[PDB]
């Protein structure tokens with residue numbers, strides 16, 4: 001695993017998230033399911049706990065956007081960058097943005113929201129990119145023939161526990 005330069009991290013283990021808005025591509029329940037599942041992957045292997053805010057400023061603000069959307073990294077239309085998220089800290093840090101010029105799916109065929117979101121939360125928590133081809137935090141997007149076979153790698157577990165420790 002790799003962390004980010006200067007090893008940014010949360011210095012608290014109760015985190016909040018807000019889903020600021022929603023993609024046209026999936027029902028809200030499917031997006032919520034992807035986000036919750038994405039949070040749970042990391043929750044499971046750490047002392048971190050998450051709760052949702054429906055207003056105000058949460059730690060991890062999650063949103064869907066296209067092209068220019070208010071930060072240093074405008075999205076790029078269909079393909080290429082699918083999403084991004086910022087390392088732990090205040091304001092934009094911790095936030096995760098999804099390119100709504102992708103077509104978001106819960107299936108095996110398109111751009112899978114759960115898999116991307118789980119990866120992005122890893123960033124939001126302070127994991128950078130892994131050299132392990134099997135890791136969630138590997139830099140190149142792929143999916144699975146069987147989404148039920150998803151498992152967080154030991155490399156990812158090691159990385160996140162390097163930041164926050166194992167579960168209590």
Ligand SMILES: O=C(O)[C@@H](Cc1c[nH]c2ccccc12)NS(=O)(=O)c1ccc(N2CCC(c3ccccc3)CC2)cc1
Pocket residue numbers: 080081082083084085115116119120123134135136137138139140141142143144150151
């Ligand atoms: O978050 C990104 O990486 C951003 C933005 C981005 C581009 N340069 C960067 C340099 C530093 C930080 C962010 C970026 N690029 S991106 O949108 O192209 C991207 C998104 C997701 C992924 N996955 C990797 C493998 C994965 C998986 C693993 C195990 C089992 C099943 C599935 C699912 C998600 C990779 C790359």
Ligand SMILES: [Ca+2]
Pocket residue numbers: 075076077078079080081082099101102
């Ligand atoms: Ca794109």
Ligand SMILES: [Ca+2]
Pocket residue numbers: 058059060061089090091092093094095
């Ligand atoms: Ca934030």
Ligand SMILES: [Ca+2]
Pocket residue numbers: 023024025099100101102103104
């Ligand atoms: Ca879209």
Ligand SMILES: [Zn+2]
Pocket residue numbers: 069071073084097
């Ligand atoms: Zn952005």
Ligand SMILES: [Zn+2]
Pocket residue numbers: 119123129137138139
């Ligand atoms: Zn990444």
